[PDB]
């Protein structure tokens, strides 16, 4: 997932290729939209849902081997990964459907928070060393605005 490029356009498009069997499609679509809204709220970036493989960010829920050199392991461990800006698989976000996807307090992992984190990568952001930042490499659920000052500065430094 090595990348040093940023998008050369601000009108970013995404395609929800498939869904997780843990949540209603309406809940999934809204979670992704809200995750994207976090980033557009502090930048001139916009996110438009499309239905084509030509979308910049292709969102895919997979299990085990799913098309790249980093197959998912299973329950826990790797929750998801995303490729840095660029053509093709670049910019795409993959989620391990072997995980229990949920939202808010309770068991399972928040699709909202994990997606927001992954979209950060798909925009060119690297991991943060700030434990409270959304771009921190370790998952942990908490309430309140996901974007930490460190996350806002990182994204604006790019766009
Ligand atoms: N796979 C990861 C770890 S991960 O368990 O899949 C992960 C950890 C945390 C994630 O976002 C997040 C960060 C803070 C709070 C809530 C959610 C998303 C994904 C990762 O950060 N992938 O993007 C790593 F570090 F590369 F191994
Ligand atoms: Ca904006
Ligand atoms: Ca792509
Ligand atoms: Ca896993
Ligand atoms: Ca699942
Ligand atoms: Cl599906
Ligand atoms: Cl798949
Ligand atoms: Cl949540
Ligand atoms: Zn993948
Ligand atoms: Zn990450």
mmCIF file of C-alpha atoms and ligand atoms in Angstrom:
data_model
loop_
_atom_site.group_PDB
_atom_site.id
_atom_site.type_symbol
_atom_site.label_atom_id
_atom_site.label_comp_id
_atom_site.label_asym_id
_atom_site.label_seq_id
_atom_site.Cartn_x
_atom_site.Cartn_y
_atom_site.Cartn_z
ATOM 1 C CA UNK A 1 0.000 0.000 0.000
ATOM 2 C CA UNK A 2 2.898 2.327 -0.803
ATOM 3 C CA UNK A 3 1.703 5.619 -2.248
ATOM 4 C CA UNK A 4 2.835 9.227 -2.507
ATOM 5 C CA UNK A 5 0.190 10.517 -4.910
ATOM 6 C CA UNK A 6 -2.951 12.527 -4.303
ATOM 7 C CA UNK A 7 -6.042 12.857 -6.488
ATOM 8 C CA UNK A 8 -5.814 15.549 -9.155
ATOM 9 C CA UNK A 9 -9.521 16.261 -8.875
ATOM 10 C CA UNK A 10 -11.818 17.030 -5.954
ATOM 11 C CA UNK A 11 -15.016 15.487 -7.325
ATOM 12 C CA UNK A 12 -14.349 11.971 -6.011
ATOM 13 C CA UNK A 13 -16.675 9.111 -6.967
ATOM 14 C CA UNK A 14 -17.300 5.836 -5.162
ATOM 15 C CA UNK A 15 -18.970 2.571 -6.040
ATOM 16 C CA UNK A 16 -20.373 0.229 -3.429
ATOM 17 C CA UNK A 17 -19.679 -2.964 -5.351
ATOM 18 C CA UNK A 18 -21.105 -5.436 -2.803
ATOM 19 C CA UNK A 19 -22.429 -5.586 0.770
ATOM 20 C CA UNK A 20 -21.796 -7.202 4.147
ATOM 21 C CA UNK A 21 -24.433 -9.705 5.270
ATOM 22 C CA UNK A 22 -24.381 -8.155 8.768
ATOM 23 C CA UNK A 23 -26.248 -4.940 7.987
ATOM 24 C CA UNK A 24 -29.179 -3.725 5.841
ATOM 25 C CA UNK A 25 -28.097 -2.199 2.527
ATOM 26 C CA UNK A 26 -29.729 1.098 3.573
ATOM 27 C CA UNK A 27 -27.614 1.145 6.742
ATOM 28 C CA UNK A 28 -24.431 0.356 4.784
ATOM 29 C CA UNK A 29 -25.003 3.083 2.176
ATOM 30 C CA UNK A 30 -25.663 5.618 4.922
ATOM 31 C CA UNK A 31 -22.627 4.574 6.923
ATOM 32 C CA UNK A 32 -20.336 5.030 3.920
ATOM 33 C CA UNK A 33 -21.970 8.358 3.022
ATOM 34 C CA UNK A 34 -21.529 9.620 6.582
ATOM 35 C CA UNK A 35 -17.913 8.438 6.600
ATOM 36 C CA UNK A 36 -17.237 10.382 3.407
ATOM 37 C CA UNK A 37 -19.108 13.419 4.756
ATOM 38 C CA UNK A 38 -16.513 13.665 7.533
ATOM 39 C CA UNK A 39 -13.817 14.389 4.985
ATOM 40 C CA UNK A 40 -15.824 16.723 2.761
ATOM 41 C CA UNK A 41 -16.777 18.748 5.823
ATOM 42 C CA UNK A 42 -13.212 20.050 6.191
ATOM 43 C CA UNK A 43 -11.999 20.158 2.585
ATOM 44 C CA UNK A 44 -13.150 21.195 -0.896
ATOM 45 C CA UNK A 45 -13.549 17.490 -1.660
ATOM 46 C CA UNK A 46 -16.914 16.027 -2.648
ATOM 47 C CA UNK A 47 -18.035 12.410 -2.864
ATOM 48 C CA UNK A 48 -20.544 11.095 -5.366
ATOM 49 C CA UNK A 49 -21.902 7.574 -5.396
ATOM 50 C CA UNK A 50 -21.851 5.992 -8.860
ATOM 51 C CA UNK A 51 -22.567 2.529 -10.263
ATOM 52 C CA UNK A 52 -19.513 1.729 -12.383
ATOM 53 C CA UNK A 53 -16.070 0.170 -12.047
ATOM 54 C CA UNK A 54 -14.815 3.569 -13.260
ATOM 55 C CA UNK A 55 -15.445 5.086 -9.827
ATOM 56 C CA UNK A 56 -12.317 6.380 -8.101
ATOM 57 C CA UNK A 57 -13.045 4.485 -4.911
ATOM 58 C CA UNK A 58 -14.385 0.974 -5.406
ATOM 59 C CA UNK A 59 -15.751 -0.351 -2.109
ATOM 60 C CA UNK A 60 -15.651 -4.129 -1.711
ATOM 61 C CA UNK A 61 -16.515 -6.534 1.096
ATOM 62 C CA UNK A 62 -14.393 -9.650 0.730
ATOM 63 C CA UNK A 63 -13.328 -12.835 2.484
ATOM 64 C CA UNK A 64 -9.917 -14.506 2.344
ATOM 65 C CA UNK A 65 -8.405 -14.045 -1.137
ATOM 66 C CA UNK A 66 -10.279 -11.198 -2.777
ATOM 67 C CA UNK A 67 -8.259 -10.015 -5.761
ATOM 68 C CA UNK A 68 -5.015 -8.568 -4.425
ATOM 69 C CA UNK A 69 -1.805 -9.568 -2.687
ATOM 70 C CA UNK A 70 -3.282 -9.193 0.802
ATOM 71 C CA UNK A 71 -6.042 -11.765 1.477
ATOM 72 C CA UNK A 72 -8.112 -11.361 4.606
ATOM 73 C CA UNK A 73 -7.330 -13.643 7.535
ATOM 74 C CA UNK A 74 -10.713 -14.097 9.171
ATOM 75 C CA UNK A 75 -12.298 -13.139 12.472
ATOM 76 C CA UNK A 76 -10.488 -10.159 14.004
ATOM 77 C CA UNK A 77 -6.933 -9.274 13.058
ATOM 78 C CA UNK A 78 -6.959 -7.342 9.789
ATOM 79 C CA UNK A 79 -10.296 -5.502 9.578
ATOM 80 C CA UNK A 80 -9.789 -3.706 6.271
ATOM 81 C CA UNK A 81 -7.276 -1.919 4.049
ATOM 82 C CA UNK A 82 -7.324 0.701 1.276
ATOM 83 C CA UNK A 83 -4.998 1.635 -1.574
ATOM 84 C CA UNK A 84 -3.537 5.144 -1.996
ATOM 85 C CA UNK A 85 -4.721 7.491 -4.807
ATOM 86 C CA UNK A 86 -4.167 6.358 -8.376
ATOM 87 C CA UNK A 87 -5.748 4.431 -11.268
ATOM 88 C CA UNK A 88 -7.222 0.948 -11.085
ATOM 89 C CA UNK A 89 -7.198 -0.782 -7.727
ATOM 90 C CA UNK A 90 -5.565 2.383 -6.349
ATOM 91 C CA UNK A 91 -7.973 4.296 -4.117
ATOM 92 C CA UNK A 92 -10.153 1.217 -3.504
ATOM 93 C CA UNK A 93 -11.324 0.223 -0.010
ATOM 94 C CA UNK A 94 -11.653 -3.450 0.997
ATOM 95 C CA UNK A 95 -13.474 -4.714 4.101
ATOM 96 C CA UNK A 96 -13.142 -8.235 5.604
ATOM 97 C CA UNK A 97 -16.671 -9.631 5.648
ATOM 98 C CA UNK A 98 -15.441 -12.321 8.066
ATOM 99 C CA UNK A 99 -15.613 -9.584 10.716
ATOM 100 C CA UNK A 100 -18.814 -8.749 12.572
ATOM 101 C CA UNK A 101 -19.833 -5.340 11.200
ATOM 102 C CA UNK A 102 -22.036 -3.118 13.364
ATOM 103 C CA UNK A 103 -22.281 0.522 14.519
ATOM 104 C CA UNK A 104 -22.079 2.380 17.838
ATOM 105 C CA UNK A 105 -21.538 0.748 21.227
ATOM 106 C CA UNK A 106 -21.693 -3.048 21.438
ATOM 107 C CA UNK A 107 -19.894 -6.051 19.945
ATOM 108 C CA UNK A 108 -18.539 -6.083 16.409
ATOM 109 C CA UNK A 109 -16.614 -3.334 14.625
ATOM 110 C CA UNK A 110 -18.066 0.028 13.569
ATOM 111 C CA UNK A 111 -18.344 0.070 9.772
ATOM 112 C CA UNK A 112 -18.685 3.860 9.989
ATOM 113 C CA UNK A 113 -15.403 4.460 11.816
ATOM 114 C CA UNK A 114 -13.456 1.798 9.948
ATOM 115 C CA UNK A 115 -14.760 3.103 6.603
ATOM 116 C CA UNK A 116 -13.887 6.704 7.487
ATOM 117 C CA UNK A 117 -10.350 5.526 8.352
ATOM 118 C CA UNK A 118 -10.058 3.609 5.057
ATOM 119 C CA UNK A 119 -11.308 6.576 3.029
ATOM 120 C CA UNK A 120 -8.503 8.541 4.669
ATOM 121 C CA UNK A 121 -6.019 6.124 3.092
ATOM 122 C CA UNK A 122 -7.898 6.249 -0.242
ATOM 123 C CA UNK A 123 -7.351 10.017 -0.160
ATOM 124 C CA UNK A 124 -3.625 9.731 0.430
ATOM 125 C CA UNK A 125 -3.444 9.836 4.220
ATOM 126 C CA UNK A 126 -0.935 7.629 6.051
ATOM 127 C CA UNK A 127 -1.308 6.271 9.579
ATOM 128 C CA UNK A 128 -1.097 8.729 12.465
ATOM 129 C CA UNK A 129 0.995 8.332 15.615
ATOM 130 C CA UNK A 130 -1.705 10.105 17.651
ATOM 131 C CA UNK A 131 -3.641 7.417 19.628
ATOM 132 C CA UNK A 132 -6.828 9.506 19.452
ATOM 133 C CA UNK A 133 -6.625 10.298 15.746
ATOM 134 C CA UNK A 134 -8.932 8.448 13.366
ATOM 135 C CA UNK A 135 -5.877 7.486 11.315
ATOM 136 C CA UNK A 136 -4.332 5.616 14.235
ATOM 137 C CA UNK A 137 -3.613 1.998 13.084
ATOM 138 C CA UNK A 138 -5.381 0.369 16.049
ATOM 139 C CA UNK A 139 -9.160 0.061 16.299
ATOM 140 C CA UNK A 140 -11.088 1.310 19.319
ATOM 141 C CA UNK A 141 -14.656 2.546 19.525
ATOM 142 C CA UNK A 142 -15.463 5.908 21.086
ATOM 143 C CA UNK A 143 -18.217 8.499 20.792
ATOM 144 C CA UNK A 144 -17.794 12.031 19.470
ATOM 145 C CA UNK A 145 -16.393 13.516 16.208
ATOM 146 C CA UNK A 146 -14.117 10.927 14.556
ATOM 147 C CA UNK A 147 -11.754 13.485 13.019
ATOM 148 C CA UNK A 148 -8.980 14.604 15.353
ATOM 149 C CA UNK A 149 -7.112 17.889 14.748
ATOM 150 C CA UNK A 150 -4.283 15.744 13.429
ATOM 151 C CA UNK A 151 -6.645 14.157 10.881
ATOM 152 C CA UNK A 152 -8.015 17.523 9.740
ATOM 153 C CA UNK A 153 -4.521 18.979 9.297
ATOM 154 C CA UNK A 154 -3.372 15.948 7.366
ATOM 155 C CA UNK A 155 -6.203 15.990 4.836
ATOM 156 C CA UNK A 156 -6.112 19.783 4.337
ATOM 157 C CA UNK A 157 -2.343 19.656 3.830
ATOM 158 C CA UNK A 158 -3.162 17.516 0.791
ATOM 159 C CA UNK A 159 -6.290 19.250 -0.562
HETATM 160 N N1 LIG B 1 -5.049 -3.203 8.790
HETATM 161 C C1 LIG B 1 -4.601 -2.113 9.672
HETATM 162 C C2 LIG B 1 -5.174 -2.340 11.075
HETATM 163 S S1 LIG B 1 -6.987 -2.576 11.172
HETATM 164 O O1 LIG B 1 -7.294 -3.433 12.364
HETATM 165 O O2 LIG B 1 -7.480 -3.257 9.929
HETATM 166 C C3 LIG B 1 -7.808 -1.043 11.368
HETATM 167 C C4 LIG B 1 -7.679 -0.340 12.560
HETATM 168 C C5 LIG B 1 -8.356 0.864 12.736
HETATM 169 C C6 LIG B 1 -9.162 1.373 11.721
HETATM 170 O O3 LIG B 1 -9.758 2.595 11.814
HETATM 171 C C7 LIG B 1 -10.069 3.040 13.063
HETATM 172 C C8 LIG B 1 -9.137 3.788 13.777
HETATM 173 C C9 LIG B 1 -9.467 4.318 15.020
HETATM 174 C C10 LIG B 1 -10.734 4.098 15.553
HETATM 175 C C11 LIG B 1 -11.664 3.345 14.842
HETATM 176 C C12 LIG B 1 -11.333 2.814 13.598
HETATM 177 C C13 LIG B 1 -9.292 0.662 10.531
HETATM 178 C C14 LIG B 1 -8.616 -0.541 10.352
HETATM 179 C C15 LIG B 1 -5.077 -0.773 9.099
HETATM 180 O O4 LIG B 1 -4.971 0.268 9.746
HETATM 181 N N2 LIG B 1 -5.556 -0.829 7.860
HETATM 182 O O5 LIG B 1 -6.025 0.354 7.228
HETATM 183 C C16 LIG B 1 -3.072 -2.119 9.722
HETATM 184 F F1 LIG B 1 -2.656 -1.263 10.650
HETATM 185 F F2 LIG B 1 -2.579 -1.755 8.542
HETATM 186 F F3 LIG B 1 -2.636 -3.337 10.032
HETATM 187 CA CA1 LIG B 2 -16.389 21.005 1.986
HETATM 188 CA CA1 LIG B 3 -9.731 2.905 -7.910
HETATM 189 CA CA1 LIG B 4 -9.966 -10.239 9.682
HETATM 190 CA CA1 LIG B 5 -19.423 -9.932 8.233
HETATM 191 CL CL1 LIG B 6 -23.861 -7.881 -2.407
HETATM 192 CL CL1 LIG B 7 -15.480 -10.104 -3.263
HETATM 193 CL CL1 LIG B 8 -20.330 4.213 15.055
HETATM 194 ZN ZN1 LIG B 9 -7.878 -6.115 -0.564
HETATM 195 ZN ZN1 LIG B 10 -5.130 1.965 8.315
#
